Design a protein around this ligand. Structure first.
Ligand code: HEC
Ligand SMILES: CCCCCCCCCCCCCCCCCC(=O)OC[C@H](C)OC(=O)CCCCCCCCCCCCCCCCC
Ligand code: SF4
Ligand code: SF4
Ligand code: SF4
Ligand code: F3S
Lengths: 929, 52
């Protein structure tokens, strides 16, 4: 309880030399990009003065068409993490940066005496052309130096399948805008992948269902575990993850592949799925695609290129370009070829660009014991990772908002990573650390970036070319050239072995925490996982029929014993799952993540075996626990007959006969309160629930925009998560093969808002614009608004929820004292809320007002695209559409007169401003029985 | 209804002590059981009270 008669003397400081570009109070968006796996996502990040506070999508970029992922959006709390490495560290104790360049250059003259032998580098799968040119300068200065590229969710099997079918390595850019059916095969392509935002928009562009739409996408999936593409899949099949090599061998023989050598037969529901998915592939040959993700072996990846070359997709929707990444034939096998080189000496310098392989290595690859045999182990990462303690040297990371850099996206388009801010802690990025190893330690990150692009610009007037590349983000004088391929024959001749009986393990990246590189990010942790709405826990995902054979409920801790290792995993049962196919997720069990990701789940990387790195069948469950915490944030995953109010679901077979078949043509409701007249800037929202894949990028972008506090695991289990927007799975149907439906439930901004009439101090009123104003400074904390809110989209600050993964919220010793580096990530237009006030989705009223007030100074009206909320500017599928309702030529006034426009809880006369477009899941005639 | 359990104070005390515990439970059923499960299934809570 802070208390004073006056607020203290607030100092206002100007600059000392104010730069020309900065106007105090204006957002000043900068066009950068983020190296996610090795590829760029393409960003438009908002730097108010120097500090970037909100990552948005670069609409010029090919990967993100103006909308980012869940992980890509929450790179701001990773930037302003107080657990970031604030100083370099030599053998445990802190040090300077120039002590490193006196120790590294003293070890670089000892390597030139040899042929640069012990100079192994362990970067992760980089595509950026400046670090490729610095590597190719490093590997021509030191001849016998090796560059190994380890990535745990790398495209190892995806490139080994491109070698096994085409000869050389080829990059495969799929194109779903000309695609009628998308027969995936263990391919979560709408996930946080290097192309996950474009493959989600192109998949959702095909199924924008309007007044005159008769043909949409189909999306046969056959997924191991329920993955977020399965929300958009209309024929998702729970396959055991070991039969997907045999579903493709049953589908490559229905289409024309001569040497498929099919084996290991199918079940009666996997065979009638594959005789109908391939029947819809033999038709519409020009617009169809067979997808396969890196969970699969390299043979089926080669068969996925065999089917796509049989159906004539090459040149139409599956283009083949030169490989954008530098070393495509190096993955887990490149990490295993390094530790067998790291053993018994014969390595002297080991640079480790941000990989964290002490934590990420498979159990068959002894990277822990092979490390500390290197006399000089250097590590470059923005966290003191699991490796940085076990490394001799350690450098800061220079997170991409702090560092001058490049990155190449898929399609080959290079985008320059400008620093929006100077390095808070002197970061010294990967382009600046190789400058020390090459011999140019005083050369900055900008001096070696323009030194490369001056030589890769064959046009004159480089300053026009360079300033345009920083402005637009993209370059597009550098796209990957389309490669003519062969599709060699005789690659799947060897018959597969017997399908081994036994309970299967399935390795996955968590959609929140991909490979544990961002496990210290608080926004990604408390963001609910897509199907199983959990926050701070790795789980073992079982089917309802698998757990019934083993006899374990939704909270027991089991000791998953793989080939030699046990992991002591909790259990979350899951209806969409495959039989005997227990799924564990990466990204957890970090022992040196920081204060957010330390000991949150079980480390699934201790079960990888580097020969079965994604799935294996030798698992023993052996329950050893009971009643784990498992802080979930949904309460009931089962639509309880509340259809017509949550997710109205239909098929396209019944929509082509009746347009408004999910609407209820009912009489106008009677209200005794009358109504009000909204005549200027009527704000409404249309959420297309048919295209929402539950990517949770809108949950974490409301968090980054509206200063929403993270809440720890102990207070999520009490149902006190602060999330203004939530996605609701609902699991309609059979408990073994259900349909999972998303309802993006935010504050519906009800016109006859029942949450407002129950506010004693009137801390919740309306605009004349029409949206619901939750004023935080007036809230005395009587949680009656939350009780009368029928959707329960009100979210109360219970404790002082502020910097909660860095100080536990059950104290008042640091209640009114805040972390100084976390204050820069906050939006300066949203109230950072106190201990006892309630929150609510305010339609991003700080984005409404900042363009309503700006349109009043220049005497005009707001257009449609001038106001774009944070959940709308992030949705890769563009499910959310915000806009004026009194503007007749608007985009939301079209989407709210569609025959699928329904409002949630119209049984109550709340009259919401948020209407939902209903879900239509395009069932085949040969499979709907 | 019966005077047997009204004039007898060891019986009127047990009846009245079952109303103070019971009418607490009426106001628990009214408040919690209407709040902890409501319109939307994705907002179903439990409210096990803490020591405070
Ligand atoms: C000292 C606290 C104070 C605050 C905070 C304040 N005003 Fe205003 N304010 C106006 C006028 C006139 C407008 C323009 C109304 C419009 O354009 O719709 C306005 C508009 C605004 C707007 C912009 C509304 C929009 O549509 O963006 C804001 C914000 C605002 N006032 C805040 C006269 C005043 C005056 C009269 C001398 C006073 C004092 C005044 N305002 C004091 C204050
Ligand atoms: C009793 C009825 C009081 C009704 C009004 C409540 C006022 C609460 C308040 O002012 O908190 C002060 C401070 C936050 O609280 C504090 O920091 C210290 C509170 C200690 C008070 C100890 C006595 C309890 C009140 C009696
Ligand atoms: S939807 Fe809920 S929070 Fe929003 S105005 Fe209506 S009652 Fe209030
Ligand atoms: S529109 Fe509302 S719910 Fe959506 S991101 Fe903005 S504040 Fe959150
Ligand atoms: S509304 Fe958009 S951002 Fe949110 S879950 Fe759906 S697709 Fe993802
Ligand atoms: S009713 Fe009123 S004062 Fe605060 S929490 Fe609810 S708003």
């Amino acid at each position: 309880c802070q208390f004073a008669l006056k607020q203290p003397q607030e100092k206002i400081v100007p600059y000392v030399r104010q730069p020309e570009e900065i106007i105090h109070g204006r957002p000043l968006f900068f066009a950068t990009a983020v190296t996610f796996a090795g590829f760029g996502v393409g960003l438009l990040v908002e730097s108010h003065e120097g500090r970037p506070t909100k990552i948005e999508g670069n609409p010029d970029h090919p990967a993100s068409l103006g909308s980012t992922d869940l992980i890509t959006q929450a790179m701001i709390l990773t930037m302003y993490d107080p657990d970031r490495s604030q100083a370099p560290t030599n053998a445990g104790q802190e040090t300077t940066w120039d002590a490193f360049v006196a120790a590294a250059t003293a070890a670089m003259q000892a390597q030139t005496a040899k042929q640069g032998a012990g100079l192994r580098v362990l970067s992760g799968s980089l595509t950026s052309p400046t670090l490729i040119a610095q590597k190719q300068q490093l590997l021509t200065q030191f001849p016998q130096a090796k560059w190994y590229e380890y990535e745990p969710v790398g495209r190892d099997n995806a490139n080994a399948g491109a070698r096994l079918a085409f000869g050389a390595d080829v990059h495969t850019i799929y194109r779903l805008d000309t695609a009628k059916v998308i027969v995936g095969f263990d391919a979560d392509f709408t996930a946080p992948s290097p192309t996950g935002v474009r493959m989600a928009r192109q998949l959702a562009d095909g199924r924008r269902i309007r007044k005159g739409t008769k043909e949409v996408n189909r999306l046969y999936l056959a997924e191991s575990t329920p993955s977020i593409t399965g929300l958009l899949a209309d024929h998702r099949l729970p396959v055991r993850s070991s039969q997907i090599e045999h579903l493709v061998r049953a589908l490559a023989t229905l289409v024309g592949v001569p040497n498929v050598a099919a084996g290991a037969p199918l079940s009666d529901t996997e065979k009638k799925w594959v005789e109908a998915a391939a029947k819809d592939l033999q038709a519409n040959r020009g617009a169809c695609v067979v997808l396969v993700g890196e969970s699969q072996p390299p043979v089926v990846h080669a068969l996925g290129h065999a089917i796509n070359a049989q159906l004539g997709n090459v040149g139409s929707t599956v283009v083949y370009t030169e490989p954008v990444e530098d070393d495509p034939s190096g993955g887990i096998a490149a990490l295993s070829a390094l530790t067998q080189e790291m053993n018994a000496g014969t390595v002297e310098v080991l640079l480790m660009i941000e990989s964290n392989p002490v934590y990420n290595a498979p159990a068959d690859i002894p990277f822990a014991e092979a490390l500390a045999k290197v006399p000089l182990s250097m590590h470059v990462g923005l966290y003191r990772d699991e490796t940085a303690q076990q490394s001799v040297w350690h450098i800061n990371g220079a997170h991409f908002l702090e560092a001058w850099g490049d990155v190449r996206a898929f399609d080959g388009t290079t985008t320059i990573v400008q620093p929006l801010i100077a390095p808070l802690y002197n970061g010294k990025s990967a382009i600046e650390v190789l400058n020390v190893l090459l011999g140019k330690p005083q050369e900055t990150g900008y001096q070696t970036l323009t030194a490369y692009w001056q030589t890769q610009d064959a046009s004159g007037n480089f300053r026009v070319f360079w300033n345009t590349a920083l402005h637009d983000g993209v370059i597009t004088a550098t796209q990957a050239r389309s490669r003519q391929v062969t599709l060699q024959q005789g690659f799947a001749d060897a018959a597969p072995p017997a399908p081994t009986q036994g309970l299967e393990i399935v390795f996955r990246p968590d959609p929140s925490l991909w490979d544990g590189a961002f496990a210290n990010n608080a926004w990604l942790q408390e963001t609910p996982k897509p199907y199983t709405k959990l926050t701070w826990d790795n789980v073992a995902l079982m089917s309802v029929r698998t757990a019934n054979a083993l006899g374990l409920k939704n909270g027991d801790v089991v000791r998953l014993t793989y080939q030699g290792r046990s992991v002591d995993a909790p259990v979350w049962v899951q209806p969409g799952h495959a039989d005997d196919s227990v799924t564990v997720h990466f990204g957890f069990g970090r022992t040196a993540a920081g204060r957010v990701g330390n000991n949150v789940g079980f480390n699934a990387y201790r079960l990888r075996t580097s020969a079965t790195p994604w799935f294996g069948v030798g698992l023993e469950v052996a329950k050893v626990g009971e009643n784990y915490k498992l802080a979930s944030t949904q309460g009931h995953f089962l639509m309880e007959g509340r259809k017509k109010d949550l997710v109205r679901y239909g098929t396209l077979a019944e929509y082509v006969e009746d347009e408004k078949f999910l609407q209820v043509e009912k009489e106008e409701p009677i209200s005794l309160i009358g109504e009000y007249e909204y005549n200027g800037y009527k704000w409404g929202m249309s959420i297309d629930l048919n295209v929402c894949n539950s990517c949770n990028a809108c949950v974490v972008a409301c968090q980054s925009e509206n200063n929403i506090p993270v809440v720890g695991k102990d207070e999520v289990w009490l149902g006190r998560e602060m999330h203004w927007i939530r996605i609701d799975q609902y699991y309609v149907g059979d408990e073994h093969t259900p349909n999972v439906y998303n309802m993006v439930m935010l504050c519906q901004q009800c016109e006859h808002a029942p949450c407002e009439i129950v506010c004693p101090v009137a801390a919740t009123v309306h605009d004349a614009e029409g949206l619901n104003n939750m004023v935080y400074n007036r809230c005395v904390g009587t949680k009656y608004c939350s009780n009368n809110c029928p959707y329960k989209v009100r979210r109360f600050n219970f404790l002082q929820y502020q910097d909660v993964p860095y100080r536990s919220p059950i104290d008042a010793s640091t209640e009114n004292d805040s972390i100084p580096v976390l204050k820069m990530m906050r939006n300066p237009d949203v109230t950072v809320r106190a201990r006892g006030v309630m929150e609510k989705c305010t339609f991003c009223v700080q984005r409404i007002n900042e363009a309503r007030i700006q349109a009043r100074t220049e005497n005009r009206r707001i257009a449609d695209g001038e106001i774009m909320t944070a959940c709308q500017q992030v949705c890769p599928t563009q499910a959310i559409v915000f806009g004026d309702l009194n503007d007749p030529q608007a985009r939301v006034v079209d989407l709210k007169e569609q025959p699928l426009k329904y409002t949630s809880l119209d049984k109550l006369n709340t009259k919401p401003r948020v209407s939902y477009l209903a879900k239509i899941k395009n069932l085949n005639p040969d499979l709907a029985e | 209804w019966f005077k047997r359990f009204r004039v007898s104070l060891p019986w009127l005390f047990f009846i009245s002590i079952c109303i103070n515990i019971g009418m607490w439970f009426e106001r628990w059923v009214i408040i919690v059981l209407s709040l902890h499960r409501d319109f939307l299934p994705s907002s179903w809570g439990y409210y096990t009270p803490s020591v405070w």
